């Protein structure tokens, strides 16, 4: 399953 | 910023004249991801060419598998034509049954 | 005897068309198992392997929701970077994210990965310690600072050490027949007269999995490392892989050359020569 959140750049 | 696509044109199964098979166009090592891929039979655009999802390599460059049903014969010609920002004109690569 | 779970995310802005397209593909080892593409009407996370149909509705709905929301954040990120760099909307721009875990034979984490690229170049990367970031330019320094402020490393590290590993173990179980199949290559040598004096011997490796293979040519036991031509290993389209390797040899001397094949599914290596009759 995917990462729970992504980076906010 | 820009990398030039490499192309391989090849059948899924060993080619037998008259027998149904799948023609693959494997297009790799390109950037940006926008690309146009056409598969040709005797110079004519083949409708119903499925693209298998755009993934990427360790250098971030993209790869994709275009594929269509085909039935090779002794004289028919098959090709893959690719249009991409890194190239001035489209590159056409003809299917060679020994490759 | 390791395995990996990996996700590949791409947002690509399309000047003139609508919002940026967002694409996700997920892999267990060399097998694509899930995908998402925002150009689909009513886009959902989809199985790309038959055995993923064993995951029930709640899995698909939660992964779809995460993907959709992630696509939105990639869009925000694309706008943010346009602003950092003062770039034109007349050009398209691309944001890519790769992350994943490798696990060893014991099922323990060998390493975690989490890294992004903007327009095909490294932007920011989670270091191997899973605790610190490597930035590249001063735009990515800003991004690094923001991730340090929300302790982003802690969130990514926790995922990579826990759920990434556990889900990899789960998918390996659900897809074990496919994923552990070790299909050896079916190999043969073909013969293509080249110029009356010379011929091409092409050694074929077909229908194999995983992709890692060695396909080499020798002249009387000498490895032809300077002479052999070969293609990149390539998908058959059915989950298996293909490769060939070739040499140009004197006509009438074909017997002196051997093709050699190594692969996980071969308990012993193959040695082949061209068979005339
Ligand atoms: Na991101
Ligand atoms: Na992708
Ligand atoms: Na493996
Ligand atoms: Na879209
Ligand atoms: Na991550
Ligand atoms: Na596998």
Numbering used by the authors:
A (entry chain P): 1 to 9
B (entry chain B): 1 to 99
C (entry chain A): 1 to 277
How does the study describe this entry?
Of these MHC Ib molecules, murine Qa-1 consists of the 4 allotypes Qa-1a, -1b, -1c, and 1d, while humans encode the ortholog HLA-E. In addition to antigen recognition by T cells, Qa-1 or HLA-E are recognized by NK cells, most notably through the binding by the inhibitory heterodimeric receptor CD94/NKG2A. Loading of this leader peptide, called Qa-1 determinant modifier (Qdm) into Qa-1 is dependent on the transporter associated with antigen processing (TAP). We report the crystal structure of the non-classical MHC–Ib allele Qa-1a in complex with the Qdm peptide.
The Qa-1a/Qdm complex was crystallized in space group P21 2 21 with one complex per asymmetric unit, and diffraction data was collected to 2.04 Å resolution. The Qdm peptide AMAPRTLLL binds in an elongated fashion tightly to the binding groove, as indicated by very well-defined electron density over the entire length of the peptide. The N-terminal half is slightly smaller and mostly hydrophobic in nature, while the C-terminal half is slightly larger and contains a pronounced negative charge due to the presence of Glu116 protruding from the β-sheet platform. Surprisingly, however the N-terminus of the peptide, especially Ala1 and Met2 are bound mostly through hydrogen-bond interactions with backbone oxygens and amide, while the C-terminal part of the peptide that is accommodated in the negatively charged area of the peptide-binding groove is bound mostly through vdW interactions via Leu7 and Leu9.
